[PDB]
Design an enzyme around this catalytic site. Structure first.
Site, PDB file in Angstrom:
ATOM      1  N   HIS A   1      29.705  37.788   0.765  1.00  0.00           N
ATOM      2  CA  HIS A   1      28.768  37.823   1.885  1.00  0.00           C
ATOM      3  C   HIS A   1      28.731  39.172   2.605  1.00  0.00           C
ATOM      4  CE1 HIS A   1      30.433  33.831   1.327  1.00  0.00           C
ATOM      5  NE2 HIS A   1      29.114  33.449   1.290  1.00  0.00           N
TER       6      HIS A   1
HETATM    7  C1  LIG Z   1      35.607  17.363  -2.348  1.00  0.00           C
HETATM    8  C2  LIG Z   1      34.308  18.069  -1.998  1.00  0.00           C
HETATM    9  C3  LIG Z   1      34.236  19.200  -1.249  1.00  0.00           C
HETATM   10  C4  LIG Z   1      35.419  19.939  -0.656  1.00  0.00           C
HETATM   11  C5  LIG Z   1      33.020  19.921  -0.886  1.00  0.00           C
HETATM   12  C6  LIG Z   1      31.789  19.385  -0.714  1.00  0.00           C
HETATM   13  C7  LIG Z   1      30.840  19.806   0.330  1.00  0.00           C
HETATM   14  C8  LIG Z   1      30.241  21.017   0.461  1.00  0.00           C
HETATM   15  C9  LIG Z   1      28.737  21.269   0.471  1.00  0.00           C
HETATM   16  O1  LIG Z   1      27.689  20.402   0.789  1.00  0.00           O
HETATM   17  C10 LIG Z   1      27.937  19.083   0.529  1.00  0.00           C
HETATM   18  C11 LIG Z   1      28.389  22.709   0.002  1.00  0.00           C
HETATM   19  C12 LIG Z   1      28.075  22.642  -1.490  1.00  0.00           C
HETATM   20  C13 LIG Z   1      27.203  23.416   0.848  1.00  0.00           C
HETATM   21  O2  LIG Z   1      26.498  22.557   1.637  1.00  0.00           O
HETATM   22  C14 LIG Z   1      26.360  23.057   2.899  1.00  0.00           C
HETATM   23  C15 LIG Z   1      26.273  24.162  -0.133  1.00  0.00           C
HETATM   24  C16 LIG Z   1      24.880  24.439   0.440  1.00  0.00           C
HETATM   25  C17 LIG Z   1      26.989  25.453  -0.559  1.00  0.00           C
HETATM   26  C18 LIG Z   1      26.242  26.710  -0.375  1.00  0.00           C
HETATM   27  C19 LIG Z   1      27.005  27.911  -0.866  1.00  0.00           C
HETATM   28  O3  LIG Z   1      27.193  27.938  -2.229  1.00  0.00           O
HETATM   29  C20 LIG Z   1      27.846  28.972  -2.840  1.00  0.00           C
HETATM   30  C21 LIG Z   1      28.029  28.967  -4.226  1.00  0.00           C
HETATM   31  O4  LIG Z   1      27.588  27.934  -4.963  1.00  0.00           O
HETATM   32  C22 LIG Z   1      28.689  30.054  -4.848  1.00  0.00           C
HETATM   33  O5  LIG Z   1      28.868  30.024  -6.237  1.00  0.00           O
HETATM   34  C23 LIG Z   1      29.154  31.234  -6.851  1.00  0.00           C
HETATM   35  C24 LIG Z   1      29.173  31.163  -4.097  1.00  0.00           C
HETATM   36  C25 LIG Z   1      29.001  31.209  -2.728  1.00  0.00           C
HETATM   37  O6  LIG Z   1      29.476  32.286  -1.998  1.00  0.00           O
HETATM   38  C26 LIG Z   1      29.087  33.521  -2.476  1.00  0.00           C
HETATM   39  C27 LIG Z   1      28.348  30.101  -2.020  1.00  0.00           C
HETATM   40  C28 LIG Z   1      28.133  30.073  -0.545  1.00  0.00           C
HETATM   41  O7  LIG Z   1      28.534  30.978   0.203  1.00  0.00           O
HETATM   42  C29 LIG Z   1      27.427  28.907  -0.036  1.00  0.00           C
HETATM   43  C30 LIG Z   1      27.194  28.834   1.465  1.00  0.00           C
HETATM   44  S1  FES Z   2      32.333  38.102   2.923  1.00  0.00           S
HETATM   45 FE1  FES Z   2      32.299  35.918   2.682  1.00  0.00          FE
HETATM   46  S2  FES Z   2      34.089  35.862   1.472  1.00  0.00           S
HETATM   47 FE2  FES Z   2      34.132  38.021   1.779  1.00  0.00          FE
END
Ligand SMILES: C/C=C(C)/C=C/C=C/C(OC)[C@@H](C)[C@H](OC)[C@@H](C)CCc1oc2c(O)c(OC)cc(OC)c2c(=O)c1C
Ligand code: FES
Ligand code: HEM
Ligand code: HEM
EC number: 7.1.1.8
Lengths: 123, 74, 196, 330, 107, 127, 49
Positions: free
Chosen positions: A89
């Site tokens: 980020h």
């Molecule tokens: C046991 C279960 C657990 C702990 C978790 C479940 C719940 C979490 C969520 O929603 C349910 C969650 C998916 C979220 O929802 C807000 C999504 C929109 C995620 C958005 C998301 O994705 C990324 C991603 O895919 C990546 O891949 C390479 C890398 C990332 O950074 C660079 C991200 C990232 O920075 C974000 C905000």
């Molecule tokens: S800036 Fe989000 S993990 Fe380093």
């Protein structure tokens, strides 16, 4: 408890070594970098630390390479401040590894370590 | 034989457009070696390179050689 | 981001397997294996490819058996428990040049040559990228570019500075089928082989 | 599911399992198609006022399914254990570290240790298997709420004066789009199976190196952009979650007296501002944190929230009044 | 109170050759010995800290060695602005004390 | 980059107080390390006079400890030397300098002032 | 594993001495050649064959 041989690291180079599953960043800093690190005013830092608060020997920057935002590993020799850039980020760290710009709230953490001549012992 | 890509690259470096592009790259390369022989180069934090002009050259060559190279290969 | 940091966009070559109705060219696959064996295999593993998958694709059942038997693999211990070796069989995976990661870095200035089993799918640009990289080493870097010691310049690699030198040169391989082994021909072939 | 074996076991499905590549490519591309169709289902609901009374419960259960579906796809993505898997798992489990005082404790509990490791990937597979069945139970609850009031229609008015049976008419009408859906999914699965994924996930996960080329899955990009636009850790993750929960607010901020946008000139216009703003958010998510993009993302984020909280209540009120004074002569 | 003895005192040399000044202390300092450079213009600079570490900007041709009580400051060539007075301090205890000074002249 | 600029009376009469101000730009006194005064005698023997820290802790050479007072003003970012009841002894060029402290390498004065030459003379100047 | 003995039948110190009497495979050195290691508490009690 990892042993790193400091005599093996060249002048202006980064080395990454594993410790407890985490990456440990070690830079052999140049004289110019050491000045760059210790000539920055606290007013410009969201997490205010002197370079001396963060290193015991100014030649050896030793820190956990875990971005304090959401845990990605910052890329060495990149960014707008001569240090590390986090691709996830967009957090920029300087040559002391302090947070200078982006969503990360803190400087790169410093693990416990002692020296033993030509080698440092992280842990 | 001579490499088929090297052949097509050399051929296209010598079109009007290719000559214009190597000229601009060359005019950059001249400007740079002059900067290196004037004191305080190892301390300038503003060193110019010619990657951009090189990329324009290479891009032109790629655009011309890519659709043609494999008709010459087996 | 700067063009150097992005790397040069690889152009679109007319691969004979491009297109919905097009198979691989299996002669090119056959040749590409040779280029892999004689050039690339000295630094690059191919861990996910088993000998048997070559049969009926690029080689005969007999040819692959001879190739596999040129290598030794660990066998089951004898009646007394002492370790022992074995010629390779078709069930085995193509062996790599290095025993572990640390030995691979030692032989390459500290750099790690990736396994090539998936390399065509593990890079943007696919075949176009791999080919362009292999044929895209300039004799000299562009003016002003200060290359680290041990690094090489290649415009298609992100950041320009790559730890693999140019390794393809004209006629460094004697193609078993008579084809002129130019560098772009050899590049075309391994790349076709690596896509397979 | 072992962290040593997970990536190779998926390569084994690709190479050794008869028709294994078909199963994997169906699953991976199907997940994407699942989101395309969900966005359209939601956008349909938005346009035609399907969230309105008496279908509020229907809408709320829908929002829960959406959250569950997003969590399910993330759990599956981690199971590949490529580079994007490892850092996706790392970044997303770290979302919870923003929680006051007990946040890092939640994260180490979710990890089962010091970092994303074997415990983590084994429990994420177990959870990935479970949650689809909870989604199935929520779909039944969704259809239960649908059944007591029936579907709405494009005019936004009562359907009670002219019904036709599901059987025949809509069974065979469904069949038309089922085949079109399968055709297109087939074109991807057989002809372009990796176009909707990321090349870095054909590289085994490496705990010491985060690729410079890391990009979230495409269907997560708008939400990613929203988080990235806030230069604060806590507020970044709060605002991103709020971007999902604000869907719950629409039955209350839609002040109109008619259901749906079919006969509403201003509402139609701003609806499409919303849609294309959402696409922009996703295009920003795919871009570097660089000059024009950071500001554009912050403005698009504002437009996203302003739609539900400001534009819809203001515009629907104005349209209410316009409908009145255009016909009343006193 | 420690005191340092800078020898040789004000010795000169030619237009590009090595030279070895030294500093000896009464008590045993660890390696806590810095070297400063006072120009003819009164401009004073840091050159060496911890008796081997180069400061920012000071050229490669400067060395610095020793331990215990005997120390050093070696140069490669004196081309040409190496003409100044060189000092040395300890900092293992307060108060810090400097050397007698060592002028460098050109014949 | 850090800059130390010195100002003050380049001539005081015996039995009076010498006052020198050291103005720092590019870095705060309160931010970092140690802020020192030293003097260079004509006989070329450098003497460390004292410091004030970023916390405001004083530390003086015992040779001069009972006379001087090293103060600071955070608002204007400058520290001061005040050497009381001066003699012809105190005829030197005075320097202010910053020293860092790393726990391994110890102290090192890395940023120096320009140097203010003071003469203890009975002559009359023009203030 | 050696660690499970601690607090059960032996002290932390006793178990450490016992484990260190045995050699286990370690990670290869900087050059990739294999090397051994005294045992630690994380290790499992080794067998005769
Ligand atoms: C046991 C279960 C657990 C702990 C978790 C479940 C719940 C979490 C969520 O929603 C349910 C969650 C998916 C979220 O929802 C807000 C999504 C929109 C995620 C958005 C998301 O994705 C990324 C991603 O895919 C990546 O891949 C390479 C890398 C990332 O950074 C660079 C991200 C990232 O920075 C974000 C905000
Ligand atoms: S800036 Fe989000 S993990 Fe380093
Ligand atoms: C043989 C013709 C050959 C091929 C094919 C080849 C390909 C190749 C690729 C695609 C990469 C990955 C580049 C990327 O990250 O985008 C790569 C990397 C390295 N190689 Fe290679 N390589 C071929 C041959 C050889 C030979 C014979 C050697 C060893 C002398 C070699 C070495 C390397 C190294 C080292 C790298 C790492 C690059 C880096 O990290 O900077 N290759 N190769
Ligand atoms: C796996 C997910 C889901 C399934 C299987 C599902 C299924 C259905 C079905 C069969 C209908 C009737 C036909 C139609 O209108 O398309 C329906 C209606 C509806 N669904 Fe869903 N749904 C899902 C997710 C959601 C989501 C994510 C939302 C919103 C956040 C939602 C909101 C609605 C609404 C409001 C209606 C009524 C539309 C109207 O009649 O105007 N659904 N759904």
């Amino acid at each position: 408890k990892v042993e790193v041989n400091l005599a093996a690291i060249p002048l202006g180079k980064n080395v990454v070594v594993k410790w407890q599953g985490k990456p440990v960043f070690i830079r052999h800093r140049t004289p110019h970098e050491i000045q760059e690190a210790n000539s920055v005013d606290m007013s410009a830092l969201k997490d205010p630390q002197t370079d001396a608060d963060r290193v015991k020997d100014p030649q050896w920057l030793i820190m956990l390479g875990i971005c304090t935002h959401l845990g990605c590993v910052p890329i060495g020799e990149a960014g707008d401040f001569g240090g590390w850039f986090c691709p996830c980020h967009g957090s920029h760290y300087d040559i002391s590894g302090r947070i200078r710009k982006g969503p990360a709230p803190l400087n790169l953490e410093i693990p416990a370590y002692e020296f033993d001549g030509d080698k440092v012992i992280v842990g | 034989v001579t490499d088929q890509l090297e052949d097509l690259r050399e051929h296209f470096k010598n079109t009007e457009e290719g000559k214009a592009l190597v000229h601009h790259y060359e005019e950059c390369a001249e400007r740079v070696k002059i900067q290196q022989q004037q004191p305080g180069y190892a301390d300038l934090e503003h060193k110019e390179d010619c990657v951009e002009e090189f990329f324009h050259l290479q891009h032109y060559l790629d655009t011309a050689t890519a659709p043609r190279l494999f008709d010459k290969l087996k | 981001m700067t063009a150097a940091e992005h790397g040069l966009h690889a152009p679109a070559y007319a691969w004979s397997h491009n297109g919905p109705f097009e198979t691989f060219d299996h002669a090119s696959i056959r040749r590409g294996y040779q280029v892999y064996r004689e050039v690339c295999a000295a630094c690059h593993s191919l861990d996910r490819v088993a000998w048997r998958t070559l049969v009926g694709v690029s080689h005969t059942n007999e040819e692959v058996r001879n190739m596999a038997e040129e290598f030794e693999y660990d066998d089951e211990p004898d009646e007394q428990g002492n370790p022992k070796k074995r010629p390779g069989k078709l069930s085995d995976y193509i062996p790599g040049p290095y025993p572990n990661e640390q030995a691979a870095r030692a032989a390459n200035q500290g750099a790690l040559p990736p396994d090539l089993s998936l390399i065509v799918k593990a890079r943007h640009g696919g075949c176009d990228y791999i080919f362009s990289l292999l044929t895209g080493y300039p004799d000299e870097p562009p003016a002003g570019v200060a290359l680290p010691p041990g690094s090489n310049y290649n415009p298609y690699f992100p950041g320009g500075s790559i730890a693999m030198a140019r390794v393809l040169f004209d006629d460094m391989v004697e193609y078993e089928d008579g084809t002129p082994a130019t560098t772009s021909q050899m590049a075309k072939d391994v790349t076709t082989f690596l896509n397979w | 599911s072992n962290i040593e074996l997970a990536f190779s076991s998926v390569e084994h499905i690709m190479r050794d399992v008869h028709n294994g590549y078909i199963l994997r490519y169906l699953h991976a591309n199907g997940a994407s198609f699942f989101f395309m169709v969900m966005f359209m289902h939601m956008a349909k609901g938005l346009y035609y006022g399907s969230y309105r009374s008496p279908r509020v419960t229907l809408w709320n259960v829908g929002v829960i399914i959406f959250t569950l579906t997003i969590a399910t796809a993330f759990l599956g993505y981690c199971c590949v254990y490529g580079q994007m898997s490892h850092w996706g798992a790392t970044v997303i489990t770290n979302l919870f570290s923003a929680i006051p005082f007990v946040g890092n404790d939640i994260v180490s509990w979710l990890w089962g240790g010091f970092s994303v490791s074997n415990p983590t990937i084994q429990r994420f597979f177990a959870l990935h298997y479970l949650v689809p069945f909870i989604i199935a139970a929520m779909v039944i609850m969704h259809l239960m709420a649908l059944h007591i009031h029936g579907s709405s229609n494009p005019l936004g008015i009562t359907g009670n004066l002219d019904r036709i049976p599901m059987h025949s008419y809509f069974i065979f009408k469904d069949l038309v789009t089922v085949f079109l859906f399968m055709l297109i999914l087939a074109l991807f699965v057989f002809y372009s199976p990796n176009t909707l994924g990321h090349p870095d996930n054909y590289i085994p996960g490496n705990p010491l190196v985060t690729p410079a080329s890391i990009v979230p899955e495409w269907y997560l990009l708008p939400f990613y952009a929203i988080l990235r636009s806030i230069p604060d850790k806590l507020l970044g993750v709060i605002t991103m979650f709020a971007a999902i929960l604000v869907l719950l607010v629409l039955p209350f901020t839609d002040r109109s007296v008619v259901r749906g946008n079919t006969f509403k000139v201003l509402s139609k216009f701003f609806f499409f501002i919303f849609v294309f703003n959402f696409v922009l958010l996703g295009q920003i998510g795919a871009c570097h944190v660089e000059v024009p993009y950071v500001l554009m993302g912050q403005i698009a984020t504002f437009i996203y929230f302003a739609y539900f909280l400001i534009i819809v209540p203001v515009i629907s009120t104005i349209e209410n009044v316009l409908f009145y004074i255009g016909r009343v002569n006193k | 109170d420690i005191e340092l003895t800078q020898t040789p005192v004000s010795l000169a040399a030619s237009l590009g050759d090595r030279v070895t000044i030294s500093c000896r202390a009464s008590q045993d300092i660890n390696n806590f010995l810095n070297w400063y450079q006072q120009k003819p213009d009164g401009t004073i600079k840091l050159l060496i800290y911890y008796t081997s570490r180069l400061h920012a900007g000071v050229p490669s041709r400067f060395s610095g060695s020793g331990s215990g009580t005997d120390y050093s400051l070696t140069i490669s060539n004196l081309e040409p602005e190496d003409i100044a007075t060189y000092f040395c301090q300890h900092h293992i205890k307060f108060p810090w004390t400097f050397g007698a000074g060592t002028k460098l002249e050109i014949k | 980059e850090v800059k130390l600029q010195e100002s003050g009376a380049g001539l005081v009469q015996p039995s009076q107080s010498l006052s020198l101000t050291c103005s720092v730009t590019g870095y705060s006194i309160t931010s970092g390390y140690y802020w020192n005064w030293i003097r260079l005698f004509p006989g070329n023997k450098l003497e460390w006079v004292g410091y004030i820290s970023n916390v405001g802790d004083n530390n003086y050479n015992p040779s001069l400890k009972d006379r001087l007072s090293i103060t600071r003003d955070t608002s204007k970012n400058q520290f001061f030397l005040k050497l009381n009841s001066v003699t012809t002894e105190d005829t030197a060029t005075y320097y202010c300098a910053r020293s860092e402290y790393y726990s391994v390498t110890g102290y090192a004065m890395d940023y120096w002032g320009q140097g203010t030459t003071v003469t203890v003379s009975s002559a009359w100047r023009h203030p």
